[PDB]
Design a protein around this nucleic acid. Structure first.
Length: 76
DNA sequence: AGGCTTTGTTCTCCTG
DNA sequence: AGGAGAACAAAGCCTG
């Protein structure tokens, strides 16, 4: 068994945004989508980012509670 | 199976 | 010393 990383603010926000974007732009692939998502992300300010920042932090805390002895060991 | 693409978090290396 | 560099979370498509 090999766990995986908790989502950060950007990833949490991109779940529902990618979706809405893919609707609007069916002809686009996730590569291109991601570029548009980037710009849309940095277009937000503190207040607009806060809920996802908070959401990434509770997700983060939960990950530690779920996996106490976890340690991130990326591959080479 | 793994690349393409993004941000943010966390890892593994270390020269002068 | 701390930071450059890269992995890896999400998505779904798509050759040989």
């Amino acid at each position: 068994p090999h766990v995986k990383r908790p989502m950060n603010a950007f990833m949490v926000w991109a779940q529902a945004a990618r979706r809405k974007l893919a609707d609007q732009y069916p002809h686009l692939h996730n590569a291109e989508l991601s570029k548009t998502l980037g710009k849309l992300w940095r277009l937000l300010n503190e207040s607009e980012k806060r809920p996802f920042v908070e959401e990434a932090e509770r997700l983060r805390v939960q990950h530690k509670k779920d996996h106490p002895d976890y340690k991130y060991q990326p591959r080479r």
